[PDB]
């Protein structure tokens, strides 16, 4: 009852309880990170070559700072803990963040932000730090492709005849990358591969339509 075995299992119960509490805390942090990252994405989708592209962009950078602050807390919550141990609790959140910053970066620079470039921003001092796993990164970029096809079709809609082709190129590259990796990668990633093919097709088909229409000199008027 106060026996040695019972003492052991009490320290076990306290230890576990502590770990599960930390896990739950991280899960709430991760949900919040996910929601705010997706909101950032929705915002960025508001850009339309129109003037406010700058303001929008700036505002997104504000939101992302906020998200990073959440991430900061996660880093604190994890100090003195083994990295991947609590990973299942935050992976989704991280992935969403990856989708967000990368989307933003593509909007600004037409390039793919690297894993290390993303981590660079996840260092905080007063000094804590968090690193996105290559797999978090991979999944997040996969989703990024869907947001990009969304942007391509959107632009076609509002008269843009440049953007679509830029996206088609970037997406052809990313697809070739995932095909390079192939089955030397985690199951999750291969799951992505199909939806990835879907997106690529939609964009190449958009650009094809543009090429066909725009190459036409009509000889019959109305």
């Amino acid at each position: 009852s106060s026996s040695p075995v019972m003492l052991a299992f009490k320290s076990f119960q306290q230890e576990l309880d502590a770990r599960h509490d930390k896990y739950e805390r991280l899960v709430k942090l991760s949900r919040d990170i996910t929601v705010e990252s997706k909101r950032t994405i929705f915002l960025l989708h508001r850009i339309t070559s129109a003037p406010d592209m700058e303001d929008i962009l700036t505002e997104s950078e504000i939101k992302l700072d906020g998200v990073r602050q959440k991430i900061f807390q996660v880093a604190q919550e994890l100090s003195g803990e083994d990295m991947h141990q609590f990973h299942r609790a935050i992976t989704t959140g991280l992935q969403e963040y990856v989708e967000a910053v990368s989307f933003q970066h593509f909007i600004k620079t037409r390039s793919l932000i690297s894993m290390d470039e993303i981590n660079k921003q996840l260092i905080f001092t007063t000094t804590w730090r968090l690193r996105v796993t290559p797999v978090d990164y991979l999944l997040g970029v996969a989703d990024l492709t869907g947001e990009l096809m969304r942007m391509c079709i959107n632009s076609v809609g509002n008269g843009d005849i440049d953007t679509p082709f830029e996206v088609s190129q970037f997406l052809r590259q990313v697809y070739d990358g995932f095909s390079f990796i192939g089955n030397t990668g985690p199951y999750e990633v291969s799951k992505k591969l199909y939806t990835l093919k879907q997106s690529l097709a939609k964009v190449e088909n958009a650009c094809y339509a543009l090429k066909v229409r725009g190459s036409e000199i009509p000889k019959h008027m109305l």
Partner: protein, 214 residues
Amino acid sequence: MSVSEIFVELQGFLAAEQDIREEIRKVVQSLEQTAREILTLLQGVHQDIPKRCLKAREHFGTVKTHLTSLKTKFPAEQYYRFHEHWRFVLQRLVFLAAFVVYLETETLVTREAVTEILGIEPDREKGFHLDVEDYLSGVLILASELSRLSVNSVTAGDYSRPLHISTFINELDSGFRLLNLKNDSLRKRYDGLKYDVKKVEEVVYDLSIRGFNK
């Protein structure tokens, strides 16, 4: 207590809810009948607009009485217990109303306007409400109908229609882009709006290139 007592009450509640579901299903089947009839009337350019709009609004009365009938089939404050069982039809109706209102005025119907057309109480008045999400869905359906309409218009020589539809639908797009959506039915349907907008934009291009700079 008594376990038998408890489960008898519950089998009760459940049998009751099942009855409510079947009554609501009868009324809803009637409403789908009417909605299909209305849509048939409104097409159309697919053209005395005021006339067909008129007949349609006449059928909307059948709709009114039927929805007032539905109100009596279930507990007013248990709307969302049974929401899913009319959500689809309610959206189709929002769509039809919006479509009538468009063909006439070339404007987007307001929610309160749609409620008044259907025989329903605004959000401020206790009663059968129109969920914001069901509204939005109806509007998306409209947008789809309208891209189709722009194409068939150009086929019928009505070369002015596509440009009006263009302004309207581009406006809708800007609106929806303002929303932050969960991964639900509404986001799924919204995802098609961009394609509707694209189709219309294409039609407009074809026209401008073929001697129609307006």
